[PDB]
Design a protein around this ligand. Sequence first.
Ligand SMILES: C/C=C(/C)C(=O)O[C@H]1C(C)=C2[C@H]([C@@H]1OC(=O)CCCCCCC)[C@@](C)(OC(C)=O)C[C@H](OC(=O)CCC)[C@@]1(O)[C@H]2OC(=O)[C@@]1(C)O
Ligand SMILES: Nc1ncnc2c1ncn2[C@@H]1O[C@H](COP(=O)(O)OP(=O)(O)CP(=O)(O)O)[C@@H](O)[C@H]1O
Ligand SMILES: [Mg+2]
Ligand SMILES: [Mg+2]
Ligand code: NA
Length: 994
Amino acid sequence: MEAAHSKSTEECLAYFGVSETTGLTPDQVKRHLEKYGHNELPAEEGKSLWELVIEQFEDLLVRILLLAACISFVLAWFEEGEETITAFVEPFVILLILIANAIVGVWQERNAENAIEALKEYEPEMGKVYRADRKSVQRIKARDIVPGDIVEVAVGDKVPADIRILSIKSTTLRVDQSILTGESVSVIKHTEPVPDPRAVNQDKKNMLFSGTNIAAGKALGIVATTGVSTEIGKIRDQMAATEQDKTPLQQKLDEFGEQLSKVISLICVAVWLINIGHFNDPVHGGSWIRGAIYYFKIAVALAVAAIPEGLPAVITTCLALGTRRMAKKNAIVRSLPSVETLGCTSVICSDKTGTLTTNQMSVCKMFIIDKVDGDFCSLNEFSITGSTYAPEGEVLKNDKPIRSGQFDGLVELATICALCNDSSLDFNETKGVYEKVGEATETALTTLVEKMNVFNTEVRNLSKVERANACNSVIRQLMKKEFTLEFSRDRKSMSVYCSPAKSSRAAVGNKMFVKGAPEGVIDRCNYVRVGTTRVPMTGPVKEKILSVIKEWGTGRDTLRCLALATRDTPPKREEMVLDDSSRFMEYETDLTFVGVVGMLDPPRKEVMGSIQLCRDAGIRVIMITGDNKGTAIAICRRIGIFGENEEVADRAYTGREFDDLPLAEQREACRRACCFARVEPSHKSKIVEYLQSYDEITAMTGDGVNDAPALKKAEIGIAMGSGTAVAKTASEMVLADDNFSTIVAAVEEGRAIYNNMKQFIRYLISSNVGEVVCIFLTAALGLPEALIPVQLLWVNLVTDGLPATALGFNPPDLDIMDRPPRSPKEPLISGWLFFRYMAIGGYVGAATVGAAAWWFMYAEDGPGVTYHQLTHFMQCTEDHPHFEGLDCEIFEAPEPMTMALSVLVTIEMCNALNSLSENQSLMRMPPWVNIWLLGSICLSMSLHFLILYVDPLPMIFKLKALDLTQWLMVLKISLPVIGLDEILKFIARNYLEG
Ligand SMILES: C/C=C(/C)C(=O)O[C@H]1C(C)=C2[C@H]([C@@H]1OC(=O)CCCCCCC)[C@@](C)(OC(C)=O)C[C@H](OC(=O)CCC)[C@@]1(O)[C@H]2OC(=O)[C@@]1(C)O
Ligand SMILES: Nc1ncnc2c1ncn2[C@@H]1O[C@H](COP(=O)(O)OP(=O)(O)CP(=O)(O)O)[C@@H](O)[C@H]1O
Ligand SMILES: [Mg+2]
Ligand SMILES: [Mg+2]
Ligand code: NA
């Protein structure tokens, strides 16, 4: 029964055919259980370790790699010779990476919470109901409760389902609904029907929401909905339907996969089309089998050189490091892939209270009526000092300190602030600061009465824990608070019924002290107070009060204004029903206006600046606030969102105004608006949706489960540190300090991290290109394999891994925040850069093949057989080309390979330097610009020698030490790469910029 809040109490019982006294009969329970199912959200989809491991092999690249582990395996088997010490190494190395890859992948899934599963923290195990099969109450499992049965909840209980309250047994019922309505103050529940069938949860004052807590009292009610039909259930379904896309990088990396896999196959075909010359050879002769192994062998190499095996780990390493660095700035990122997307932030939708502002309320102006005499009218405007909650400050008129007591209006003004309040101050012996007890708004009032001290009550003698609520006490001792009519959004005011203290059996003197939003309260005033006297509210004077209020709330003061008033002749105690909030407004009629107080919720001292960085970064900032439209714009102009005098007609909307617009015009509004006030539950989510239709990477804030859907949907959901765990688990980032500026700071870090990743990413893929040139060259030509798998793998995981990781620390640019947000569709490599890496690759393809073929031609220590046509044969099934001399295994000489491997390695340490900057020569930006790079290149070489002299290794890698002569040829072929890049960089600077 979704609409239970709008139905009468008798209507719900009638609807479910149940009696309040007996409860449901076992037949009903059974029948209802089958119609509505159990009261619980569906279980998470169980993903098994097996399935969690099989997924690790879904990526195109880890599949190609696996395939190569097979070909390599098979070959390692059906191979000639007897060296099994290095034979099965190639396949086992590949497999190990595929294993560590799985282990890591699976490891992440074990420890990784999900928002949906976090909601279940709010469903209790048990609940208490009354069923026709037993007189007494019986506590059962929440899972077994059903729509229709009578339930009982008491203070401490966690509501097991969405319940329509039938009767409140205690005196009053208070509920902690924080997780659902964001209301941190417990709210009072009634049993009268709430008329609007379309009322939002906050106004359903006759409902208990599953997952909430009974703050105080005891009540009986009928279950309206259960499971996924509850408020928290509907939130669970919205989240499950929300699908977060893959980050721009992940997508680029995915497209790279398909293509790399598509190129690897075309290079194979090619190597085949270049060896078609074998179809013109006699069937007899030639060791075919020793030719098939050659193709496959290079195929494996083809793949191993094409796949940047170490990239994923570098990215991760760099991301962990940035993350730890962002934490230092209070920005807690939960998803490493989010650091990127965060830098792309196009829009930032932020809540005002506690994020843009401090939520440290302080009254700083107040006014009463000075006198009324016909058309003439004068008010008494005042000012207060002290922005804290501490009773340290003072009232001043025309800037001159006065004593409140000398004015009567202020005595009463102060009475109202003290009595019509549920808040109090408390001095922390520890922090030595006065804390607030209750709503920030009411505490500001409490703080005000202490400063005013209408009765001059000497308090300087009193301690600090006493100074706290001194003047208040004085006022409480004067009037007796008989009861209070809670605040409610419909009437936007609250009041307390009071009777004098020192008074015997009397039927006169009772008063009501009303406080609330000015327009509503002032409208219910038929009288204005002047000191101690009273006269009829006149059109004019009502304008005077209203204009000042408009000035304080709409003007630069951006003050939250409150009208204070009294009902001199309130109704008789017995003539009031303190059960139907709906009658509270009438009770607060025929009032007497006493004055206004305007408090300030100050903007964080860093937001103005952060708002400016956003404008500089081309990032739009949208404010979402509970304030009315006028004050919301005023605050927006104040913190810089809007210009002091710019037109914002169609750039700020209220929830109501927004709903009235047709879908088409709502979408349009969302591209222009920077201010949303009085926004509905479904709005944050709709705004995100509209923003995404314009392809903007959105950042949205929130803290309760009710914000969870929106947070999940926004590219970057931002949760408050002080918010719920659900909001946190549903978000990409958590603000440890709740501060808006912490967001902007995180965005810049996000831009700097990616610029670096772009460098080490292009660096790594750049080599993989060269490696694949060498393999294709050393094949289409038919030369001895220049480089082999086990070697390449070391270069891509260790040799090139270090420089890459160091690259992640390149200093960031200065105008990092003077540039607009990066387009997600922006490729990492294209245009001239593509050509640059095209050439560089062709170069590394030669520099390797050459240094290998060099040692087989013009090299001393090696077959100085120049032009000996290594091409001619690798069969030696003839030995004819070489008359005298029995030796055909020097083709496998490890000396040349070392030349290729040292060339690669050397060039990559060089290319790592060509990476410090995309287009700046090493002239303007020297290698020492990143000391971590240098130190990293020093470590990569010390590791190169490590595998050259430490016996166990040189064999495994098929390597041998080099001559100081040869090492020079390595340099004479590597070091030039830098000049090559410099020419290319140069060409891009002064011949393609503009
Ligand atoms: C990794 C190694 C190699 C050799 C590879 O196949 O890279 C290609 C490839 C798949 C792309 C290319 C390589 O393309 C070529 O070399 C063109 C064909 C001629 C090959 C002849 C070989 C003898 C990248 C690497 O290189 C250069 C130097 O042009 C740049 C870029 O890559 C990126 O932007 C990186 C994405 C994370 C991609 O065009 C990319 O495809 C895409 O979808 C992109 C957008 O991704
Ligand atoms: N305890 C209280 N007593 C009387 N009036 C109050 C009040 N708290 C707020 N008001 C008045 O009611 C109007 C606001 O309604 P509400 O209190 O729900 O909004 P808000 O400004 O507190 C944001 P949120 O609803 O998100 O907490 C305020 O602008 C103020 O004038
Ligand atoms: Mg409020
Ligand atoms: Mg919230
Ligand atoms: Na999200």
